[PDB]
């Protein structure tokens, strides 16, 4: 079974830094694409970026608005995912999810099947 | 003072002529030639090599490497169909973008026979037999093994020799056929059926895959060069 | 150059297998249809004349067209010579890696009257000048300056109403072949420029009016046509699938292999 | 690229035939369209992937279709458990975008 | 003044006038075929009626 | 039998018990430079035993859903023995290669590779206006990997590595026109190619120009039942043939 929990959220001043962590359990961590999707208060979803598996070389693919300020990485030892936040603004206050993805045919469709419980990050 | 008379056709610019013309650089000394390997003397040296055919489009595999693999499982009944596509090597979307079809889309007529090479890229212990039919038109597409065995076929067994060559002969009323789509000069259908099943030992993955190549035989010829429809342009670069 | 005729066959039952081969060796089979079935002895009279190289490439095609205005400042056109600004000639030349050909350059010059304001506008016949500058020489920068005196540069003059002008240019290159692709940089430190544009230096092409500013502006337009002769080709290449995007390189956006059908069995 | 969902707020009595649309600006492929479901104050969930395939755990009443730039999701009968918000996702180029959202109201 | 064969299903005459070789017309009559350097690029020659992997 | 070869070169020897035939170039064996095509004004240096031997590159792991690899040949050997020392001290140089890709598995695995050797492979950048840098095109004796998803346009200087377009814009199925062999794990275990010198200039620099590119693309992906050994590697072994250099200068 698939289980993703996350922690690290809280109130952080504008201009500051923050580190979120998404923990994975119940599946092999080196074979699945891992996404980062945020959502503001009662608004539409927004995708931030993902990180490929070991078969493609662990490269990252950010969005257009978050490149240069955010950074996705994973640890080599155990199943744990990171998200490094830098230079926060006022509109970065949202709810942050951590989704998984998989191959459906032999190909890779771009859906996100298993989702995290949702951690909250607010600024002031 | 020789009397001449200019015929019609004077002072026109035909884009496919052959005339002499005065040189702009008199007594130029060109760079001497060198034996670079792999000289193409004719465009029909290109269309006799193999090219993997994307037989497995299905709208989800076209943006992947999944389009070239034909899936083969171990069934529970017999006589199932593996694939099937009509044989129009300039208009059908299966043979449209291979190296054979990308030369036929520069020409207009074609004539000759077409080989079809298959390769069982499965396990080392899996065994089975396949039927590779070909039905000339006039009827529909064959629906069963009993209807497809009537045409031109070849029964292929997998062993040490992995590959097999079905050679589609040239059966037509005209000396040529159109590259573009036409009801009047249709060429037929190519199908493939399970002869027996695919048996495997224990601890072997069941689903094996099959590649499929295409080429032309040594009596292929084209005619009436035209422009290609696979390119598009709106402004300069 | 005829093609091979099909010999007759008979029913066989023997140990010789022409169909069963191995295509792992990178060797396509030479199987003739008189080996897997019963055929009749037919004579082929077809020919491969139109599928030769010289009958495939020696056809005229436009590469560029520029406009220039008579009664104006900066009215004169220019063009660096390269075959990568169209989409139907560039795709044909990228079937081979190395080429070697002559040319027959042909210009088609039109004209169109601009909205003048004076009355009783009567113009005489116009005269055009196409100047070719080899790579390195001095370039003119104004319509009237004295660099247009073509002391050594070959240039043709043409009045309207006659046959279109035409000149022929031999194989002007340093190496032994026009390299259509160049995988490598231009400097030994491997910085900056990457790709084909380090070999492209074939000269420019300047166009201008000859007449003065009489009574009404005229905006002309010249189209240029290539025609390769005596062509040789080496190292064939798969044809381009995705659309072109730039002139100086091969940048592209990823697209599917073919268009799609609905299932694997639907004809 | 941007998706437009319409109408945003929809009411539904039990037993009626209900459909919602998801219109794209530019043409997308049929294999890269998905449909999500998010209830009140919980994490989202995959419902339809590649515009016609039912996911795991979804009942057989849901059925989506469409091609090109117009797509639709049709439920046969409305129940009390499927009153939530539905988003559609596309991908033609980066980034992946989501729709505005269609809120389904029980009646 | 060369005399050639004029491709058909009879002769003609072609004379060069200019002093270069890049002023001649297109050749269009060189028919040479050698597909063996693309179809059979192997070292050990394999006969058609034999098995390939002996 | 037609299943055993034994290639000897210099002081190294490659033997195989289960292999296909040997595909030799465009029908021509690599030879030295004649005096009809020579353009240099001075004597060339032919070491001919210290360079013509089998160098072995770095192994790569064939995972269950891999994409492909490429090597950018003539500077993969830039740090390899005495071939990498004559490349620095000389200005010109011509070679011909002998590529030998080997990969073995049991009789219960399945899969199929395609081993081509393309000349003059221009790659396309991720951003449209830019061009890829040196570090992303070729690694020092290490493979650069393809990707089954496409690379975003937001990256500045990165190689577009979607597999179904092979990085060059062409269809990936049409790559068989170049000299190539298939490593089918049912019947084969290795693939051999002998490539002559393909260039428009009779001698070229070795550090600015990579005139060859060896691509390995898995068509039918590696699949096995549970229980078998999951770690299958791929090793490449290159050997230059008939190498000569020219134009001695300082080290760089």
PDB file of C-alpha atoms in Angstrom, chain C residues 74-220:
ATOM      1  CA  UNK C  74      18.088  52.629 -46.912  1.00  0.00           C
ATOM      2  CA  UNK C  75      16.388  51.210 -49.953  1.00  0.00           C
ATOM      3  CA  UNK C  76      18.641  48.324 -51.011  1.00  0.00           C
ATOM      4  CA  UNK C  77      18.537  44.677 -50.056  1.00  0.00           C
ATOM      5  CA  UNK C  78      21.130  42.222 -48.827  1.00  0.00           C
ATOM      6  CA  UNK C  79      21.287  38.524 -48.063  1.00  0.00           C
ATOM      7  CA  UNK C  80      23.971  36.201 -46.773  1.00  0.00           C
ATOM      8  CA  UNK C  81      23.926  33.094 -48.933  1.00  0.00           C
ATOM      9  CA  UNK C  82      22.694  29.952 -47.179  1.00  0.00           C
ATOM     10  CA  UNK C  83      20.138  27.272 -47.956  1.00  0.00           C
ATOM     11  CA  UNK C  84      18.503  27.088 -44.531  1.00  0.00           C
ATOM     12  CA  UNK C  85      15.765  29.700 -44.784  1.00  0.00           C
ATOM     13  CA  UNK C  86      13.169  27.592 -46.613  1.00  0.00           C
ATOM     14  CA  UNK C  87      11.526  24.372 -45.544  1.00  0.00           C
ATOM     15  CA  UNK C  88      11.283  22.423 -48.807  1.00  0.00           C
ATOM     16  CA  UNK C  89      14.850  22.736 -50.048  1.00  0.00           C
ATOM     17  CA  UNK C  90      16.414  22.375 -46.602  1.00  0.00           C
ATOM     18  CA  UNK C  91      14.669  19.060 -45.998  1.00  0.00           C
ATOM     19  CA  UNK C  92      15.913  17.681 -49.310  1.00  0.00           C
ATOM     20  CA  UNK C  93      19.547  18.596 -48.728  1.00  0.00           C
ATOM     21  CA  UNK C  94      19.528  17.070 -45.238  1.00  0.00           C
ATOM     22  CA  UNK C  95      19.063  13.599 -46.679  1.00  0.00           C
ATOM     23  CA  UNK C  96      22.815  13.499 -47.288  1.00  0.00           C
ATOM     24  CA  UNK C  97      25.658  14.555 -45.058  1.00  0.00           C
ATOM     25  CA  UNK C  98      28.247  15.712 -47.615  1.00  0.00           C
ATOM     26  CA  UNK C  99      27.423  17.229 -51.002  1.00  0.00           C
ATOM     27  CA  UNK C 100      29.307  18.711 -53.937  1.00  0.00           C
ATOM     28  CA  UNK C 101      27.597  20.635 -56.721  1.00  0.00           C
ATOM     29  CA  UNK C 102      27.648  23.644 -59.002  1.00  0.00           C
ATOM     30  CA  UNK C 103      24.807  26.152 -59.250  1.00  0.00           C
ATOM     31  CA  UNK C 104      22.664  28.022 -61.752  1.00  0.00           C
ATOM     32  CA  UNK C 105      21.451  31.087 -59.903  1.00  0.00           C
ATOM     33  CA  UNK C 106      18.323  32.680 -61.352  1.00  0.00           C
ATOM     34  CA  UNK C 107      16.551  35.871 -60.313  1.00  0.00           C
ATOM     35  CA  UNK C 108      12.946  36.896 -60.927  1.00  0.00           C
ATOM     36  CA  UNK C 109      12.476  40.628 -60.382  1.00  0.00           C
ATOM     37  CA  UNK C 110       9.025  42.196 -60.126  1.00  0.00           C
ATOM     38  CA  UNK C 111       7.815  45.708 -59.369  1.00  0.00           C
ATOM     39  CA  UNK C 112       4.833  47.563 -57.944  1.00  0.00           C
ATOM     40  CA  UNK C 113       3.917  51.240 -57.847  1.00  0.00           C
ATOM     41  CA  UNK C 114       3.644  52.850 -54.429  1.00  0.00           C
ATOM     42  CA  UNK C 115       0.958  55.420 -53.516  1.00  0.00           C
ATOM     43  CA  UNK C 116       2.538  58.645 -54.757  1.00  0.00           C
ATOM     44  CA  UNK C 117       0.830  62.047 -54.551  1.00  0.00           C
ATOM     45  CA  UNK C 118       1.844  63.902 -57.721  1.00  0.00           C
ATOM     46  CA  UNK C 119      -0.113  63.762 -60.967  1.00  0.00           C
ATOM     47  CA  UNK C 120       0.925  62.681 -64.483  1.00  0.00           C
ATOM     48  CA  UNK C 121       3.374  60.038 -63.320  1.00  0.00           C
ATOM     49  CA  UNK C 122       5.223  58.551 -66.294  1.00  0.00           C
ATOM     50  CA  UNK C 123       8.077  56.228 -65.572  1.00  0.00           C
ATOM     51  CA  UNK C 124      10.626  54.771 -67.989  1.00  0.00           C
ATOM     52  CA  UNK C 125      11.804  51.177 -67.765  1.00  0.00           C
ATOM     53  CA  UNK C 126      13.684  50.342 -64.589  1.00  0.00           C
ATOM     54  CA  UNK C 127      17.167  48.902 -64.266  1.00  0.00           C
ATOM     55  CA  UNK C 128      18.359  46.638 -61.481  1.00  0.00           C
ATOM     56  CA  UNK C 129      21.806  45.626 -60.299  1.00  0.00           C
ATOM     57  CA  UNK C 130      22.647  42.444 -58.399  1.00  0.00           C
ATOM     58  CA  UNK C 131      26.120  42.574 -56.874  1.00  0.00           C
ATOM     59  CA  UNK C 132      27.894  39.542 -55.435  1.00  0.00           C
ATOM     60  CA  UNK C 133      30.509  40.129 -52.747  1.00  0.00           C
ATOM     61  CA  UNK C 134      32.974  37.328 -51.905  1.00  0.00           C
ATOM     62  CA  UNK C 135      33.614  36.813 -48.172  1.00  0.00           C
ATOM     63  CA  UNK C 136      35.895  39.549 -46.917  1.00  0.00           C
ATOM     64  CA  UNK C 137      35.553  42.336 -49.444  1.00  0.00           C
ATOM     65  CA  UNK C 138      34.222  45.828 -48.843  1.00  0.00           C
ATOM     66  CA  UNK C 139      30.471  46.218 -48.550  1.00  0.00           C
ATOM     67  CA  UNK C 140      28.481  49.192 -49.749  1.00  0.00           C
ATOM     68  CA  UNK C 141      26.392  51.007 -47.233  1.00  0.00           C
ATOM     69  CA  UNK C 142      24.360  53.478 -49.098  1.00  0.00           C
ATOM     70  CA  UNK C 143      22.481  53.454 -52.287  1.00  0.00           C
ATOM     71  CA  UNK C 144      24.637  56.056 -53.924  1.00  0.00           C
ATOM     72  CA  UNK C 145      28.166  55.642 -52.585  1.00  0.00           C
ATOM     73  CA  UNK C 146      31.103  54.685 -54.752  1.00  0.00           C
ATOM     74  CA  UNK C 147      31.562  51.173 -53.542  1.00  0.00           C
ATOM     75  CA  UNK C 148      29.049  50.038 -56.138  1.00  0.00           C
ATOM     76  CA  UNK C 149      31.644  50.390 -58.804  1.00  0.00           C
ATOM     77  CA  UNK C 150      32.347  46.609 -58.912  1.00  0.00           C
ATOM     78  CA  UNK C 151      36.027  46.968 -59.740  1.00  0.00           C
ATOM     79  CA  UNK C 152      36.417  43.195 -59.423  1.00  0.00           C
ATOM     80  CA  UNK C 153      33.134  41.855 -58.014  1.00  0.00           C
ATOM     81  CA  UNK C 154      30.936  40.100 -60.580  1.00  0.00           C
ATOM     82  CA  UNK C 155      27.576  41.764 -60.966  1.00  0.00           C
ATOM     83  CA  UNK C 156      24.810  41.704 -63.549  1.00  0.00           C
ATOM     84  CA  UNK C 157      22.553  44.463 -64.815  1.00  0.00           C
ATOM     85  CA  UNK C 158      19.008  43.901 -65.972  1.00  0.00           C
ATOM     86  CA  UNK C 159      16.167  46.008 -67.342  1.00  0.00           C
ATOM     87  CA  UNK C 160      12.534  45.062 -66.921  1.00  0.00           C
ATOM     88  CA  UNK C 161      10.661  43.296 -69.689  1.00  0.00           C
ATOM     89  CA  UNK C 162      13.377  40.902 -70.835  1.00  0.00           C
ATOM     90  CA  UNK C 163      14.181  37.323 -69.928  1.00  0.00           C
ATOM     91  CA  UNK C 164      15.233  36.740 -66.307  1.00  0.00           C
ATOM     92  CA  UNK C 165      18.977  36.854 -65.621  1.00  0.00           C
ATOM     93  CA  UNK C 166      21.006  33.739 -64.953  1.00  0.00           C
ATOM     94  CA  UNK C 167      24.577  32.958 -63.959  1.00  0.00           C
ATOM     95  CA  UNK C 168      26.498  29.834 -63.002  1.00  0.00           C
ATOM     96  CA  UNK C 169      28.865  29.401 -60.062  1.00  0.00           C
ATOM     97  CA  UNK C 170      31.314  26.497 -59.617  1.00  0.00           C
ATOM     98  CA  UNK C 171      32.050  24.588 -56.406  1.00  0.00           C
ATOM     99  CA  UNK C 172      33.424  27.338 -54.158  1.00  0.00           C
ATOM    100  CA  UNK C 173      34.565  25.732 -50.932  1.00  0.00           C
ATOM    101  CA  UNK C 174      37.664  25.096 -48.890  1.00  0.00           C
ATOM    102  CA  UNK C 175      37.139  21.447 -48.016  1.00  0.00           C
ATOM    103  CA  UNK C 176      36.227  18.704 -50.424  1.00  0.00           C
ATOM    104  CA  UNK C 177      32.473  18.845 -49.794  1.00  0.00           C
ATOM    105  CA  UNK C 178      29.734  21.104 -48.483  1.00  0.00           C
ATOM    106  CA  UNK C 179      29.261  19.715 -44.992  1.00  0.00           C
ATOM    107  CA  UNK C 180      25.559  19.854 -44.208  1.00  0.00           C
ATOM    108  CA  UNK C 181      26.186  19.065 -40.531  1.00  0.00           C
ATOM    109  CA  UNK C 182      29.063  19.932 -38.234  1.00  0.00           C
ATOM    110  CA  UNK C 183      29.109  18.412 -34.756  1.00  0.00           C
ATOM    111  CA  UNK C 184      31.635  20.592 -33.024  1.00  0.00           C
ATOM    112  CA  UNK C 185      32.527  24.056 -31.908  1.00  0.00           C
ATOM    113  CA  UNK C 186      34.569  26.674 -33.715  1.00  0.00           C
ATOM    114  CA  UNK C 187      37.156  27.547 -31.061  1.00  0.00           C
ATOM    115  CA  UNK C 188      39.609  25.256 -29.318  1.00  0.00           C
ATOM    116  CA  UNK C 189      38.353  26.259 -25.864  1.00  0.00           C
ATOM    117  CA  UNK C 190      34.894  24.794 -26.699  1.00  0.00           C
ATOM    118  CA  UNK C 191      32.959  27.959 -25.901  1.00  0.00           C
ATOM    119  CA  UNK C 192      30.181  29.907 -27.520  1.00  0.00           C
ATOM    120  CA  UNK C 193      29.255  28.938 -31.040  1.00  0.00           C
ATOM    121  CA  UNK C 194      28.167  25.354 -31.654  1.00  0.00           C
ATOM    122  CA  UNK C 195      27.034  23.739 -34.872  1.00  0.00           C
ATOM    123  CA  UNK C 196      26.857  24.285 -38.621  1.00  0.00           C
ATOM    124  CA  UNK C 197      27.250  28.093 -38.667  1.00  0.00           C
ATOM    125  CA  UNK C 198      31.047  27.912 -38.356  1.00  0.00           C
ATOM    126  CA  UNK C 199      31.352  26.565 -41.901  1.00  0.00           C
ATOM    127  CA  UNK C 200      28.869  28.928 -43.560  1.00  0.00           C
ATOM    128  CA  UNK C 201      30.880  31.586 -45.360  1.00  0.00           C
ATOM    129  CA  UNK C 202      29.843  31.820 -49.016  1.00  0.00           C
ATOM    130  CA  UNK C 203      29.452  35.569 -49.512  1.00  0.00           C
ATOM    131  CA  UNK C 204      26.590  38.022 -49.625  1.00  0.00           C
ATOM    132  CA  UNK C 205      24.377  39.448 -52.339  1.00  0.00           C
ATOM    133  CA  UNK C 206      23.463  43.118 -52.763  1.00  0.00           C
ATOM    134  CA  UNK C 207      20.570  44.493 -54.821  1.00  0.00           C
ATOM    135  CA  UNK C 208      19.592  48.065 -55.701  1.00  0.00           C
ATOM    136  CA  UNK C 209      17.889  50.218 -58.300  1.00  0.00           C
ATOM    137  CA  UNK C 210      19.900  52.070 -60.903  1.00  0.00           C
ATOM    138  CA  UNK C 211      17.503  54.889 -61.842  1.00  0.00           C
ATOM    139  CA  UNK C 212      17.016  57.969 -59.707  1.00  0.00           C
ATOM    140  CA  UNK C 213      13.979  59.342 -57.877  1.00  0.00           C
ATOM    141  CA  UNK C 214      11.844  60.639 -60.705  1.00  0.00           C
ATOM    142  CA  UNK C 215       8.238  61.283 -59.694  1.00  0.00           C
ATOM    143  CA  UNK C 216       6.819  58.251 -57.884  1.00  0.00           C
ATOM    144  CA  UNK C 217       8.116  55.578 -55.528  1.00  0.00           C
ATOM    145  CA  UNK C 218       8.489  51.997 -56.703  1.00  0.00           C
ATOM    146  CA  UNK C 219       8.843  48.994 -54.396  1.00  0.00           C
ATOM    147  CA  UNK C 220      10.498  46.047 -56.114  1.00  0.00           C
TER     148      UNK C 220
END
